[PDB]
Symmetry: C2
Subunit: 246 residues, 2 copies
């Protein structure tokens, strides 16, 4: 049995955060472990309250898991603040947590720590066009401009970059030192969109843990997301969660 | 789709706490929501560090979930301290969280708050013989003495009591105002015992959420636990987790 770790925030509503990550790991037959960075009171209407955890507590969880279980893959989600990002980077380096999927899920300072401390340790970064623009500063509005963006983020240290929605049906770009690839996915419209990015990065981590090559992990993860979106349940009053059983 | 809520602690190792509860909810086709009470750095060797959450943060999570999702059942696990127990009881009462499965998972003060504030709101309490003795103070060493214990706890307010391991193959007693029942389960021996009680209370909550009567929920939950124990994976260096996929 393969094991995966998620270093992210807690979403009480269960649609994103570690709740979604663990459901995905479980669906994919992967044993899930988790290092919480923060705790939120949250539902389908949004976040009502946030409680950041002490950086040392986040580090301790990673240490406890990393030294007892073999980690075949891991992902990072919401990191709260710069101090936490730094503790996470130190832990990831110290315990050799790889391959690592860093899902931006974006404070000015936190973004800086993320790019400088964590990106260099990533096997893959999964920013959306917006996040990509934020990280790089430059604007993105065309496929060619998106590809340059992907390559630009690659220079920050990650071994691969998945810029989502690089061009709008909706195409994502996977950039590696070898070249750029393009993935196409049905722009399925629905209200149940909460946890889309989270579910994607979790599925990729799960697939990597099972031995799938990166490009194939991303394609299978996207195929899973599409199914998850199509049969999303009618739960919550706002943007409902995905159908992780899909 | 039915929804269930777990109000408990976070176990980074994934074998117990909300991690185990959510895996069980998912296995049973129930949508999981969670209100974290505390966060632990933990593995198969035990707990390395504990971080209690502010009582108001625990309350906020329950409120966020309860007002947005219909709750068909819920359970409580580790509650940290008296202040948290009290906030949980207030929330459970205020938002009408029922049916509620209170799993003791036992400070002198916290135990008092649990018994006085939370037990009266429980549809079922699942203490083990030890916990039962602690709560009542009296000693338990015989079946007849165990049955009296079960009935004794029933007088504290809960609508039903499942005293585990009341008599040692291993028999559990389910006491209600109507009478006492006895469940027998194979005393399966294995190192992977981490999260046994947690997995049981979570399965009961999940079954109640799907409309199963109490007695039947307990029997099916126990049947699930037995399977979970039999094929437990070889993960961790100490007492490994159960096979929740069972």
């Amino acid at each position: 049995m393969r094991v995966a770790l998620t270093i992210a925030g807690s979403d009480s509503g269960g649609g994103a955060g570690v709740q979604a990550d663990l459901k995905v790991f479980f669906r994919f037959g992967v044993y899930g472990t988790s290092a919480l960075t923060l705790v939120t009171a949250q539902n389908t209407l949004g976040v009502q309250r946030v409680h950041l955890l002490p950086p040392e507590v986040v580090y301790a969880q990673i240490e406890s898991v990393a030294q007892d279980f073999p980690l075949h893959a891991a992902k990072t989600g919401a990191l709260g603040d710069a101090a936490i990002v730094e503790a996470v980077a130190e832990a990831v380096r110290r315990f050799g947590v790889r391959p690592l999927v860093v899902d931006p899920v974006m404070a000015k300072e936190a973004a800086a720590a993320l790019k400088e401390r964590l990106f260099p340790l990533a096997d893959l970064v999964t920013p959306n066009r917006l996040e990509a623009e934020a990280l790089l500063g430059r604007p993105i509005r065309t496929l060619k401009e998106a590809e340059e963006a992907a390559k630009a983020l690659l220079a920050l240290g990650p071994k691969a970059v998945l810029l989502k929605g690089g061009h709008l049906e909706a195409v994502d770009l996977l950039a590696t030192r070898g070249g750029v690839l393009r993935f196409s996915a049905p722009r399925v419209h629905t209200r149940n969109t909460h946890g889309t990015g989270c579910t994607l990065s979790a599925a990729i981590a799960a697939l990597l843990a099972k031995g799938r090559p990166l490009a194939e992990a991303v394609a299978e993860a996207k195929a899973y997301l599409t199914r998850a979106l199509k049969t999303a349940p009618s739960l919550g009053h706002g943007h409902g969660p995905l159908d992780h059983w899909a």
